[PDB]
Amino acid sequence: TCQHPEPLACPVQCVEGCHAHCPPGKILDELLQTCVDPEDCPVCEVAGRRFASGKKVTLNPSDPEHCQICHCDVVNLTCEACQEPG
Amino acid sequence: TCQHPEPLACPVQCVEGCHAHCPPGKILDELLQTCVDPEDCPVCEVAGRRFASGKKVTLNPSDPEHCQICHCDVVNLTCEACQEPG
Protein backbone atom coordinates (compact mmCIF):
# COMPACT_ATOMS: atom_id res chain seq x y z
CA THR A 1 0.00 0.00 0.00
CA CYS A 2 1.00 3.64 0.03
CA GLN A 3 1.25 3.26 3.81
CA HIS A 4 2.96 -0.15 3.71
CA PRO A 5 4.63 -0.39 0.30
CA GLU A 6 7.06 -3.03 1.52
CA PRO A 7 6.10 -6.68 2.05
CA LEU A 8 5.59 -7.60 5.70
CA ALA A 9 6.03 -10.75 7.74
CA CYS A 10 2.73 -12.41 6.90
CA PRO A 11 1.44 -14.79 9.60
CA VAL A 12 -1.90 -15.26 7.79
CA GLN A 13 -2.04 -16.48 4.20
CA CYS A 14 -5.41 -14.99 3.24
CA VAL A 15 -8.45 -13.46 4.93
CA GLU A 16 -12.15 -12.90 4.32
CA GLY A 17 -13.81 -9.53 3.95
CA CYS A 18 -14.24 -6.66 1.57
CA HIS A 19 -11.23 -6.34 -0.72
CA ALA A 20 -10.55 -3.46 -3.10
CA HIS A 21 -9.88 -4.95 -6.53
CA CYS A 22 -8.89 -2.63 -9.36
CA PRO A 23 -6.61 -2.96 -12.40
CA PRO A 24 -2.82 -2.80 -11.98
CA GLY A 25 -0.77 0.37 -12.10
CA LYS A 26 -2.72 1.46 -9.02
CA ILE A 27 -1.91 0.87 -5.37
CA LEU A 28 -4.37 1.05 -2.52
CA ASP A 29 -4.37 3.73 0.14
CA GLU A 30 -6.96 3.57 2.88
CA LEU A 31 -7.43 7.27 3.61
CA LEU A 32 -8.44 7.95 0.02
CA GLN A 33 -10.56 4.81 -0.08
CA THR A 34 -9.94 3.95 -3.73
CA CYS A 35 -6.75 2.64 -5.25
CA VAL A 36 -4.44 5.26 -6.72
CA ASP A 37 -1.38 5.34 -8.95
CA PRO A 38 1.91 4.61 -7.13
CA GLU A 39 3.43 8.11 -7.46
CA ASP A 40 0.55 9.56 -5.43
CA CYS A 41 1.76 7.53 -2.46
CA PRO A 42 3.67 9.69 0.06
CA VAL A 43 6.66 7.41 -0.46
CA CYS A 44 10.18 8.12 0.82
CA GLU A 45 13.59 7.23 -0.63
CA VAL A 46 16.34 9.26 1.06
CA ALA A 47 19.93 8.77 -0.16
CA GLY A 48 18.92 5.98 -2.51
CA ARG A 49 18.04 2.87 -0.54
CA ARG A 50 14.61 1.25 -0.59
CA PHE A 51 12.57 1.40 2.61
CA ALA A 52 9.06 2.15 3.86
CA SER A 53 6.97 5.24 3.07
CA GLY A 54 8.71 7.48 5.58
CA LYS A 55 8.30 5.71 8.90
CA LYS A 56 8.39 8.01 11.92
CA VAL A 57 11.44 6.41 13.53
CA THR A 58 14.80 7.89 14.53
CA LEU A 59 17.20 5.48 12.83
CA ASN A 60 20.83 4.94 13.89
CA PRO A 61 21.02 5.20 17.72
CA SER A 62 24.20 3.16 18.02
CA ASP A 63 27.26 5.19 17.00
CA PRO A 64 27.50 8.92 17.87
CA GLU A 65 30.15 9.75 15.25
CA HIS A 66 28.04 8.03 12.55
CA CYS A 67 24.84 9.74 13.75
CA GLN A 68 23.72 10.54 10.20
CA ILE A 69 19.95 10.63 10.57
CA CYS A 70 17.51 11.02 7.69
CA HIS A 71 13.81 11.12 8.50
CA CYS A 72 11.09 11.46 5.90
CA ASP A 73 7.61 12.66 6.80
CA VAL A 74 5.72 12.05 3.54
CA VAL A 75 7.88 13.08 0.56
CA ASN A 76 10.80 15.21 1.78
CA LEU A 77 14.35 14.31 0.77
CA THR A 78 15.63 15.72 4.05
CA CYS A 79 18.21 14.80 6.66
CA GLU A 80 18.30 16.18 10.20
CA ALA A 81 21.31 17.17 12.28
CA CYS A 82 22.21 15.17 15.38
CA GLN A 83 22.59 17.00 18.69
CA GLU A 84 26.08 16.38 20.03
CA PRO A 85 26.38 15.05 23.61
CA GLY A 86 29.45 17.17 24.39
CA THR B 1 49.42 36.75 49.29
CA CYS B 2 49.94 33.94 46.83
CA GLN B 3 46.58 32.62 48.04
CA HIS B 4 44.87 36.03 48.14
CA PRO B 5 46.81 38.25 45.73
CA GLU B 6 43.88 40.61 45.32
CA PRO B 7 42.88 43.19 47.94
CA LEU B 8 39.85 42.17 49.99
CA ALA B 9 37.06 44.04 51.73
CA CYS B 10 38.89 44.90 54.93
CA PRO B 11 36.61 45.32 57.97
CA VAL B 12 39.60 45.61 60.34
CA GLN B 13 42.30 48.22 59.83
CA CYS B 14 45.15 46.45 61.62
CA VAL B 15 45.66 43.54 64.01
CA GLU B 16 48.11 42.30 66.61
CA GLY B 17 50.17 39.15 66.35
CA CYS B 18 53.17 37.68 64.61
CA HIS B 19 53.69 39.29 61.21
CA ALA B 20 56.14 38.13 58.56
CA HIS B 21 58.23 41.12 57.54
CA CYS B 22 60.74 40.72 54.73
CA PRO B 23 62.07 43.02 51.99
CA PRO B 24 59.92 43.76 48.92
CA GLY B 25 59.92 41.70 45.74
CA LYS B 26 58.62 38.84 47.88
CA ILE B 27 55.03 37.91 48.69
CA LEU B 28 53.93 35.78 51.59
CA ASP B 29 52.48 32.31 51.26
CA GLU B 30 51.42 30.48 54.39
CA LEU B 31 52.09 26.88 53.35
CA LEU B 32 55.75 27.65 52.68
CA GLN B 33 55.97 29.75 55.82
CA THR B 34 58.45 32.30 54.49
CA CYS B 35 57.79 35.00 51.94
CA VAL B 36 58.62 34.10 48.36
CA ASP B 37 59.00 35.90 45.05
CA PRO B 38 55.69 36.61 43.25
CA GLU B 39 56.22 34.23 40.31
CA ASP B 40 56.34 31.28 42.71
CA CYS B 41 52.72 31.99 43.61
CA PRO B 42 50.32 29.56 41.89
CA VAL B 43 48.65 32.56 40.27
CA CYS B 44 46.09 32.37 37.46
CA GLU B 45 45.38 34.74 34.56
CA VAL B 46 43.22 33.02 31.93
CA ALA B 47 42.34 35.00 28.77
CA GLY B 48 43.99 38.14 30.09
CA ARG B 49 41.91 39.64 32.88
CA ARG B 50 43.17 40.06 36.43
CA PHE B 51 41.55 37.91 39.12
CA ALA B 52 42.43 35.73 42.10
CA SER B 53 44.97 32.88 42.17
CA GLY B 54 42.68 30.34 40.54
CA LYS B 55 39.64 30.22 42.79
CA LYS B 56 37.74 26.94 42.68
CA VAL B 57 34.47 28.41 41.41
CA THR B 58 32.43 27.65 38.29
CA LEU B 59 32.00 31.14 36.83
CA ASN B 60 29.20 32.13 34.43
CA PRO B 61 26.01 30.23 35.42
CA SER B 62 23.64 32.72 33.80
CA ASP B 63 23.58 32.32 30.02
CA PRO B 64 23.80 28.83 28.42
CA GLU B 65 24.90 30.06 24.99
CA HIS B 66 27.68 32.14 26.61
CA CYS B 67 28.72 29.26 28.88
CA GLN B 68 32.43 29.88 28.28
CA ILE B 69 33.98 28.57 31.48
CA CYS B 70 37.66 28.86 32.36
CA HIS B 71 38.81 27.37 35.65
CA CYS B 72 42.38 27.50 36.89
CA ASP B 73 43.66 25.10 39.52
CA VAL B 74 47.11 26.56 40.28
CA VAL B 75 48.81 27.64 37.03
CA ASN B 76 46.99 26.11 34.06
CA LEU B 77 45.85 28.32 31.19
CA THR B 78 42.90 26.00 30.58
CA CYS B 79 39.23 26.32 29.73
CA GLU B 80 36.65 23.58 30.21
CA ALA B 81 33.74 22.64 27.96
CA CYS B 82 30.18 23.19 29.15
CA GLN B 83 27.78 20.25 29.11
CA GLU B 84 24.79 21.14 26.94
CA PRO B 85 21.31 20.74 28.49
CA GLY B 86 19.77 19.45 25.24
**Do the Cβ atoms of A83 and B83 come within 8 Å?**
no
**Do the Cβ atoms of A86 and B84 come within 8 Å?**
yes
Q: What experiment produced this structure?
A: cryo-EM
**CA distance, residue B82 to nearest chain A CA (Å):** 8
Contact indicator for A65, A57 with CB cutoff of 8 Å: no
Is B83's Cβ below 8 Å from some Cβ in A?
A: yes
The three-state secondary structure class of B64 is coil
The four Cα atoms A13, A14, A19, A21 give a dihedral, to 10 degrees, of 60
Looking at the domain that runs over B1-40, which CATH code has it been given? 2.10.25.10
DSSP single-letter state for residue B47: T
Is B33's Cβ below 8 Å from some Cβ in A?
A: no
DSSP single-letter state for residue B25: S
Q: What Å resolution does this PDB entry report?
A: 4.3
